[PDB]
Design a protein around this ligand. Structure first.
Ligand SMILES: O=C(O)c1ccccc1OC(F)(F)F
Ligand SMILES: [Cl-]
Ligand SMILES: [Mg+2]
Ligand SMILES: [Mg+2]
Ligand SMILES: [Mg+2]
Ligand SMILES: [Mg+2]
Lengths: 194, 194
């Protein structure tokens, strides 16, 4: 029953824009909302990808590979899944593998790719694919991995056991006063709850 | 070593503002970033999202989710019940209140996350994720009564925990809904456990 009537540009930057969204509610009344969008989205199925990288090695507990970076909107450092925007013409899977190698030095193998999922749907239209990748840590390719960070990219790699993820994240928040990503926290909670 | 130097207001709506952040990169260079902030924050965080685990004897455990029209998405989304924390409210009380308004269920706090970031490349928005158990066999949860706000139109969807990821993938394939990325990450971790 609900649908968009109009989207009116309020302010556009190089990377993000704010819109006044007019939509029809299910009782037939017109209402408005203030919506954010990225300017960068072309024909990609999503703005970006986030990679769940399961590092697998013989005689080691599986690890979730995460990254720590300064995030200017947050005014501080955040722990997140490796992530980036999808390049024009790039598949989600290629972008996930590429971002994982750039951010961490690891070469992974695709396991699964989600449909487009929304990041904060009361605020923005931004979507990602969440791509699960295994890393064969016994392979020499993955022995002493070199990250290839881009222009103005400064990322630290943090590998935590899957079997103790939530507790190890709670420990980091207690020792370093950094922020954990909501998707990473949701994943760590479900690992506990199962 | 990285820090915020200044924040220039680009555009302020009633609910959302766009800002241009100047910050010092670690190579001593000044850089800028376009960021979104909500105009409603005071709190520990902008909001809460509730992970409600409906427990009913002789039944599978269910994760209780909501479906709504999200104007920024231009479509219907499936999400954890959620909202902004009122001034003076605690995360835990906002969790139980939102859960009751959106679904009718009266639950019990099990755990509460630190403030976690929603999309830290884009915004400063944060939430507490609050795990709540619902005793579906109590008489108060027999005929759950939602208390939705003016303009709020929320449909409750309870899905089994032990197949969640498969059930979501289906809702997407056969109802063209977008699943929230927190919900999805939770679902993936339930499969990825053990
Ligand atoms: O959008 C609708 O048609 C609708 C109408 C009345 C109540 C709930 C509704 O559904 C949903 F928005 F999903 F919660
Ligand atoms: Cl639980
Ligand atoms: Mg990135
Ligand atoms: Mg990057
Ligand atoms: Mg809500
Ligand atoms: Mg609400």
């Amino acid at each position: 029953k609900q649908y968009i009537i109009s989207e009116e540009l309020i302010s556009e930057g190089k990377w993000v824009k704010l819109e006044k969204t007019t939509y029809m509610d299910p009782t037939g009344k017109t209402r408005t909302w203030e919506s954010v969008k990225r300017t960068t989205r072309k024909e990609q199925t999503a703005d970006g990808v986030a990679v769940i990288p399961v590092l697998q090695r013989t005689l080691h507990y599986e690890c979730i590979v995460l990254v720590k970076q300064f995030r200017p909107p947050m005014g501080g450092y955040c722990i997140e899944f490796p992530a980036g925007l999808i390049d024009d013409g790039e598949t989600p899977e290629a972008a996930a593998l590429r971002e994982l190698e750039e951010e961490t030095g690891y070469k992974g193998d695709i396991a699964e790719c989600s449909p487009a999922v929304c990041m904060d749907p009361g605020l923005s239209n931004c979507t990602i694919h969440i791509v699960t990748v295994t890393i064969n840590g016994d392979d020499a390719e993955n022995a002493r991995p070199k990250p290839k960070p881009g222009d103005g990219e400064f990322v630290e790699v943090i590998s935590l056991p899957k079997n103790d993820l939530l507790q190890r994240l709670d420990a980091l928040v207690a020792e370093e006063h950094l922020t954990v990503d909501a998707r990473v926290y949701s994943y760590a909670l479900a690992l506990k709850h199962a």
